[PDB]
Symmetry: D4
Subunit: 160 residues, 8 copies
Amino acid sequence: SAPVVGIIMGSQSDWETMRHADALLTELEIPHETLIVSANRTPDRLADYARTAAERGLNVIIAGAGGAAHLPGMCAAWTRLPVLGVPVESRALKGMDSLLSIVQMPGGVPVGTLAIGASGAKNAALLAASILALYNPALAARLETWRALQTASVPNSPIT
Amino acid sequence: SAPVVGIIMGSQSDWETMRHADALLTELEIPHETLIVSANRTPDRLADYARTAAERGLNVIIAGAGGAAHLPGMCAAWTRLPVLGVPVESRALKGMDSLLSIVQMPGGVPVGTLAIGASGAKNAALLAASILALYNPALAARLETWRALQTASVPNSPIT
Amino acid sequence: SAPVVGIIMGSQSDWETMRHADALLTELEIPHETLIVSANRTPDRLADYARTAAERGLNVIIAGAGGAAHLPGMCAAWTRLPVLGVPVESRALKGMDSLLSIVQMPGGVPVGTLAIGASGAKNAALLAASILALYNPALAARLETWRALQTASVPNSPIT
Amino acid sequence: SAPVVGIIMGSQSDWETMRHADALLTELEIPHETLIVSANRTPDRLADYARTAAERGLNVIIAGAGGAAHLPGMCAAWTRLPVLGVPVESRALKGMDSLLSIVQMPGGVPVGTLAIGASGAKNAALLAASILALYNPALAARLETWRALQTASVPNSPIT
Amino acid sequence: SAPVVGIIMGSQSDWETMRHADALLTELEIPHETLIVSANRTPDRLADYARTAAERGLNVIIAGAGGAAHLPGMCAAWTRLPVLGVPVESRALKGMDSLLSIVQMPGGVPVGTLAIGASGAKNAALLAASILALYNPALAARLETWRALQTASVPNSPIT
Amino acid sequence: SAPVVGIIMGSQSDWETMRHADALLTELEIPHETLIVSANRTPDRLADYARTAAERGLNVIIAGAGGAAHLPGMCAAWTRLPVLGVPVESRALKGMDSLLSIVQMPGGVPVGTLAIGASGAKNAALLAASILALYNPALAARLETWRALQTASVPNSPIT
Amino acid sequence: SAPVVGIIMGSQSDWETMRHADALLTELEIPHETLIVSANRTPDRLADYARTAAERGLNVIIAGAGGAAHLPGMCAAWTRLPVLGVPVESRALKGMDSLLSIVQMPGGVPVGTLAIGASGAKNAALLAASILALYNPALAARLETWRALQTASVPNSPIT
Amino acid sequence: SAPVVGIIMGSQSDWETMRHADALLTELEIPHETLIVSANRTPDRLADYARTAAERGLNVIIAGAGGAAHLPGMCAAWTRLPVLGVPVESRALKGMDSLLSIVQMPGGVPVGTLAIGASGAKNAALLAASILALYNPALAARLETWRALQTASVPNSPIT
Ligand SMILES: Nc1cncn1[C@@H]1O[C@H](COP(=O)(O)O)[C@@H](O)[C@H]1O
Ligand SMILES: Nc1cncn1[C@@H]1O[C@H](COP(=O)(O)O)[C@@H](O)[C@H]1O
Ligand SMILES: Nc1cncn1[C@@H]1O[C@H](COP(=O)(O)O)[C@@H](O)[C@H]1O
Ligand SMILES: Nc1cncn1[C@@H]1O[C@H](COP(=O)(O)O)[C@@H](O)[C@H]1O
């Protein structure tokens, strides 16, 4: 019941995107916590969260942010845990500012970055699942089943 | 010892970039294999490689490619293992084509994407290490040491 | 009556674009088949389709995909037949991810790429027609008539 | 023997790129002509070239140009033959201007567009070859051999 | 009463943009003609128009086109007259394909290019006016008055 | 003879580009002046230059600048003369910043924009020439000769 | 009561963006003036404003402009005062033309540039406040309180 | 004398760019410190630096970084002082990633952003100087002299 994945996001407005990560973790029965933390506006909240993540038993952090998106990278700055980053789509620049701000991390501080938007959120949860599955046979079985079902459920011909 | 990470790249011309992933894993004493696999030129080789990766004992796959860079996403299409993607800098579009073709994967098929170029390659190895560290206390401590040395070694002022 | 062109697409959502290719082939009386196949989500379905296309009598493949668009390129990986690729417009990046993922193929594995969206679908069908017309006089006549009609039907002055 | 493919390019400065199409066609023993034709500097030369291509026995035209790169689309405007387009890498915008001016052709006037640069040129020749192969069993077998050698020749591991 | 400016455009859909050029010329009492001509779809219509523009008494050509926009550049290919180009905004790429296709002309064949969209159309008409004003004192006076009025009519403080 | 075209540029570093405009005007025997004027570093110099250009007898102004490139638009803000703009290629953004800051002028204040770099500079001179040619039969014939020599001199085939 | 910050903007249409700067200055009790001034369309109005800003007691200028945005840079050309620039979002290019036109100033003429749109306007006011706070203890206290309140008011968990 | 400006940069590789800020401040005799601070590699060093800057007597902070470039925004997150940001030109994306990650800061946390590269660094120092000049008449006069010399020193014509 203790959380092994932490989903953090810069704002309430990010939740429409990051909820897709929450739903997938819940679907695969992965205990997790979901929080709002801003690198730019609550930096000390972020420092506290990220420094203590490992000792709190977290295994993977999923961080979503838009614009000058610094939350995933600064989370990675303070934790040794794998951090996955989700670029939240921005109004003007359609998430390109989000993407480059997250993916272009300097050598030495990784953020595993996923697609702009909801797809990216879903994939960050799936990527966290596959990480956790390495050591968790029951979850690995659940994940296999999920992937196989996705593949089997793709239609064979279009509907007009 | 048997490899627990696979580094695969689209061609020999990717090696100047992907060697940084190789060097990093070796530094942290993570057993790994380093291979050329082309999604487009050797599709069956990729299918076989990715489908059998888990049974062979691999835990993480690091895939690098330039241009349209199908390799990391197609690898992730065939394995349940976490796949990390390194966009290799191409002549014309500077790795922006590679970045988009790797990071914009559909929901259901994650690639954890790192920066364009040598830094991304290094970070892919470090991200793989942080994943393995979750289950390997000795590696986790070596990783902690690596990160501590990085932080401690940054100079306080620039040299002329 | 046997299909000589295969239209494949990553998803039902791609059909609003790819239907324009279907309609044009039907208009020019080119027997064809229309299928949903995903490189990223049904890779084995794609391998089967692409490996057997030639022996099934197909002459040209039209492949439509959006995002990290790998369907046309991976189709080309497994068939010797000409593959034409249609970038499906994406939400955030307006089909630029689709375009670069499709057109920037490595030397040795061509995909003939058309415009983003419906225009591209129409043109992929027309391009397939012109390919088939090389050996098919009746189709060549139909194609000439079609092109000439298009040109004659362009208005000479704007309506307010 | 009489040419069945025309390679045309906007200027001498395109030759460093377009020679790769020339070399490929020669390797596969496809009779062809190689010419400089500028849409903007020699418009009548282009009109004549493209209008008469089919009657002269050409089956496919490969057109390369940089900058605004009007040549491939304007060629396609005047011939019913398949036209394949190679964006040549320009100094300032790295072939992105060429790519867009070639690939974004309106519905009705296809250009099958290949990658920016030397790889695109090579692939334009290979795509032309796969088109001709549909009606020429001996070439089809030579093309099969070429593709098989490409696949078989990719190394298994990188060299240092 | 004979036209001294020719406004040409690729399609009826371009008219919503190019009508702004028509209105401004009419406002400044510059006799002009307004036509639909497509470089890609009516190339022979374009050749005829452009080759004969000068002998028909035209002084300036304003050409509007979107997408793989070749109309202004090909018009310039066939006339010695100044050609001004207006990038029509495109759906997916917001007129960036239009812009680069028009402005990036090779040395030797100028197109004076204006802003994407309606502003560009207005400015192409104003630019044509300033060209014609060089030799036409009455028009020069009308143009001065127009510019001065624009400047005087800019408000001094915002309305809430 | 008194200058009828002014070439102005943002700084000495623009000269490598803008000399091509100078050389072209000289070739066509168009009297002109060539100056450095910075919108941002010498704003009063620009105001004076542009406000007095017409009274001094200038007919066309060619303005080149890199980076934010305020020079051509601000020149057009102060003169009623046609202003032609040359985006100079900057180190970082390759003249894309210059292109946008020149071409996206508001309705009311035209800059006729040419390609990025040396070709744009050449074409700015040629466009200025075609403007002057409307009122100068001897120049019009020299321009016709120039254009005819350009067309006639393009080789028919590439040299190795 | 005398203004110490001047907010200027190119047009009424810019006010929906720049009003956010006005509101924040008023909130922090910073006396200011708010005007419409266009670099491109009222250059002499701008020269007058900018040359006299310092002697009128202004300390900071906030300038908002869209498109070929020259207002902030030309303001900086004529004043020694710090000029902050706000890129107003544009229709086609989503404020990217605005951004590059403002931020890419030549060495020697700074404009401190803020985010595209309303956020940028708010931040230009906050940046001006922090500048003024250096010498104004009461404002510094007000600013601290404002920042602290922002940070304390960020929610801790998302609402569904 | 005690520093009143801090120049901080992400790494030694930024120094080639950021030295231009250092040189400028020295030229204007503005006491300053010049340091390496990495948001991602030395997050605690940055927190300490930025939180204590004001109490240490700093008035302005100039921060430069390349790639994802978290340094300027995270610095601004922890200090109430004005923070000026210099995007450093990166190999792959030419400083466009840095520009977006610096300039697109959320409302509430300003970074005054300057041009990409050496010119931006110079301008960051000049902007800092214009801020300090508001309270320091002797510096204000030195700055006036600097700006006057810049304007007066621009040549009237280019040298060959
Ligand atoms: N896209 C792709 C598929 N297989 C290899 N590539 C990429 O093609 C680029 C050029 O490879 P080569 O030098 O062999 O042509 C490399 O970046 C490599 O990843
Ligand atoms: N756009 C165009 C029209 N005719 C030739 N070009 C292109 O202009 C570029 C520069 O050619 P040149 O070196 O002759 O100036 C080349 O890439 C060539 O395709
Ligand atoms: N934007 C601008 C204003 N005045 C000159 N520039 C431009 O600044 C760039 C660099 O100039 P410099 O080498 O003098 O720093 C040049 O392209 C020049 O047009
Ligand atoms: N993003 C970032 C965080 N800390 C330093 N960097 C940046 O990483 C780039 C490469 O630094 P290095 O050469 O040390 O790898 C530099 O531009 C530096 O600002």
